[PDB]
Amino acid sequence: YNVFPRTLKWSKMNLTYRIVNYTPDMTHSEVEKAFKKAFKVWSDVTPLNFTRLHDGIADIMISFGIKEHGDFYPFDGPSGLLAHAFPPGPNYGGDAHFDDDETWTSSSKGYNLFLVAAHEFGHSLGLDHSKDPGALMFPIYTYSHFMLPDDDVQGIQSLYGPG
Amino acid sequence: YNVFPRTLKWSKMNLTYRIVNYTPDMTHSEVEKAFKKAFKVWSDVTPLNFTRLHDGIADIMISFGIKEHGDFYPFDGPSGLLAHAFPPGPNYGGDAHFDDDETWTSSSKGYNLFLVAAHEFGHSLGLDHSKDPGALMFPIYTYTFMLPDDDVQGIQSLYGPGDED
Numbered sequence: 001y002n003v004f005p006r007t008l009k010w011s012k013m014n015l016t017y018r019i020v021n022y023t024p025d026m027t028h029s030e031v032e033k034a035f036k037k038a039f040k041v042w043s044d045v046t047p048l049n050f051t052r053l054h055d056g057i058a059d060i061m062i063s064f065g066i067k068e069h070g071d072f073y074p075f076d077g078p079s080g081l082l083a084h085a086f087p088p089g090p091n092y093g094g095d096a097h098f099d100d101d102e103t104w105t106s107s108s109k110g111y112n113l114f115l116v117a118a119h120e121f122g123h124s125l126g127l128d129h130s131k132d133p134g135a136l137m138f139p140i141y142t143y144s145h146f147m148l149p150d151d152d153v154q155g156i157q158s159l160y161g162p163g
Numbered sequence: 164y165n166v167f168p169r170t171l172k173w174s175k176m177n178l179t180y181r182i183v184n185y186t187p188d189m190t191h192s193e194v195e196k197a198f199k200k201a202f203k204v205w206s207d208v209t210p211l212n213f214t215r216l217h218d219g220i221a222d223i224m225i226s227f228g229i230k231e232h233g234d235f236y237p238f239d240g241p242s243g244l245l246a247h248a249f250p251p252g253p254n255y256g257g258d259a260h261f262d263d264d265e266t267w268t269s270s271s272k273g274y275n276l277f278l279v280a281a282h283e284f285g286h287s288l289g290l291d292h293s294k295d296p297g298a299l300m301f302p303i304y305t306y307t308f309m310l311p312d313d314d315v316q317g318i319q320s321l322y323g324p325g326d327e328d
């Protein structure tokens with residue numbers, strides 16, 4: 001027999017990502033900075049490294065879309081679903097999609113892109129939702145400096161080990 | 164904290180299903196019985212329970228359709244692809260689609276809905292195809308029921324045996 005195997009973790013430490021397109025709500029540089037900082041959340045406590053590609057295929061393809069956007073997991077307009085990401089694997093595996101019917105910001109006016117991305121990239125690296133209300137990986141959004149909670153540190157190091 | 168399960172499986176033992184629509188080929192009662200019997204194939208050898216919903220959102224949505232029917236796996240008219248089902252997961256995960264350009268039966272003619280459904284539900288629960296030509300999860304249709312051991316071992320590797328007796 002065969003079951004559907006789940007790439008619990010990336011079998012490689014050096015991963016690439018690409019920002020495929022951009023939300024209207026923030027400057028290109030603000031978006032790039034938020035995503036860079038969201039990966040650094042994870043790379044800071046593991047041996048994982050992330051390098052940005054500007055074209056072609058990367059392990060982690062990042063994009064903004066609305067409603068049905070090419071994976072049959074449609075978004076739902078403002079509020080509700082904010083973003084989703086696929087667990088590690090080929091093709092859509094690892095990819096992160098953000099609902100461009102939300103208002104994204106570098107601040108508190110709408111949804112903080114950095115924080116949601118940080119959460120999403122946790123899914124891209126193999127983490128599930130946490131039960132701990134204080135965990136970044138908790139399924140509920142809440143809003144200058146960010147410290148990865150111990151619950152998330154333990155979860156990700158259980159997959160990849162410490163840096 | 165939680166890491167993604169090693170294998171694609173449902174994290175709860177109580178699952179729901181919904182028959183969204185019906186083939187022209189069989190009565191509602193015939194279709195209902197075939198699907199009920201197909202779920203029992205798997206509930207009998209695990210701790211899984213399946214409850215039917217008449218509407219709303221179920222874990223396993225069952226529908227008949229033809230050609231393009233709302234996913235990346237369009238059917239192809241009579242013959243060829245008969246049906247497919249998505250592995251455990253959010254939204255369409257678990258869902259099972261039957262090509263309504265086929266002839267569905269409760270006999271040995273055409274395609275026996277019960278047998279194709281039991282196979283599809285194996286996919287809905289996290290089984291891929293087997294290389295064992297006697298397995299229910301073997302990828303080619305043949306008409307015959309007792310769940311083969313290759314499939315029992317497969318499904319129990321995921322969910323355990325439930326009550327062994």
Ligand SMILES: CNC(=O)[C@@H](NC(=O)c1ccc(-c2ccc(Cl)cc2)o1)C1CCCCC1
Nearest residue numbers: 243244245246279282299301302303304305
């Ligand atoms: C006659 N058509 C088929 O057998 C095609 N089968 C299916 O689409 C399909 C879905 C369910 C099954 C199936 C497989 C084995 C058993 Cl014991 C019962 C049902 O098969 C298959 C044929 C090989 C190429 C892929 C599609």
Ligand SMILES: [Ca+2]
Nearest residue numbers: 059091093094
């Ligand atoms: Ca990818």
Ligand SMILES: [Ca+2]
Nearest residue numbers: 077078079081
């Ligand atoms: Ca939304």
Ligand SMILES: [Ca+2]
Nearest residue numbers: 025100102103
């Ligand atoms: Ca927007």
Ligand SMILES: [Ca+2]
Nearest residue numbers: 240241242244
């Ligand atoms: Ca067909």
Ligand SMILES: [Ca+2]
Nearest residue numbers: 222254255256
């Ligand atoms: Ca479903």
Ligand SMILES: [Ca+2]
Nearest residue numbers: 263264265266
């Ligand atoms: Ca038909």
Ligand SMILES: [Zn+2]
Nearest residue numbers: 069071073097
């Ligand atoms: Zn998406």
Ligand SMILES: [Zn+2]
Nearest residue numbers: 119123129139
């Ligand atoms: Zn999440």
Ligand SMILES: [Zn+2]
Nearest residue numbers: 232234236260
């Ligand atoms: Zn389909």
Ligand SMILES: [Zn+2]
Nearest residue numbers: 282286292302
């Ligand atoms: Zn199959």
